[PDB]
């Protein structure tokens, strides 16, 4: 359940 700013990582 992550937020989209954290997707790339």
């Amino acid at each position: 359940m992550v937020d989209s700013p954290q997707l790339a990582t």
Partner: antibody
Amino acid sequence: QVQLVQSGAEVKKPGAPVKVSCETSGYRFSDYFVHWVRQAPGQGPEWIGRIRPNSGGTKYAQKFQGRVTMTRDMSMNTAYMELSGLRSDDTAVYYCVRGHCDGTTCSRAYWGQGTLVTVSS
Amino acid sequence: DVVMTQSPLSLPVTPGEPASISCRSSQSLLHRSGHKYLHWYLQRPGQSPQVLIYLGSNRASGVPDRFSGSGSGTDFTLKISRVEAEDVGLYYCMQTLQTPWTFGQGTKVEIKR
């Protein structure tokens, strides 16, 4: 163009549920979170929750946990939000909102036109 | 939740004069990737929020050049260089660094006469 098209205005009695649909075009549906926001009259906007179309995973705000169900139909590029137990304070314009980030890049949001839901007997 | 504080609440502007709207976040919206997750939108009656400025400073397509946005990670400014009748309405800042998405209090821009 990126487009999000919502279903029509709803009038519902207290306690009834509402199911709003949000059909999308102009981008790959699977690649962006779909968020739901409302704004009641005499209130600031309010984030309801989101769905991740690839997994179907959902995240809801505390206040709508247990009363909202978000889903999507990949084949139709459409997201849905069902809000149950409607009260007068749920009278609001409801928006679906394409996210900003696809995994690789981050951009602007795109908003649907809004769906007015009026709670009244 | 991230708390957004917006000022002023009411902004009457004489035609042709500029307007500035401030927004501050309770924590930095500058992500370590370099993106600033702060956006500005205009709300007019009976229609969707219109994105003005996204990711801190990018102007959306079709938005007049008289709109611009800047800021640090915590303090942001929407600038309108001249204010027309077309610009009258309710302006909000919003953060999307984290969910829930949160919104400033809103500024009511009107024409001063």
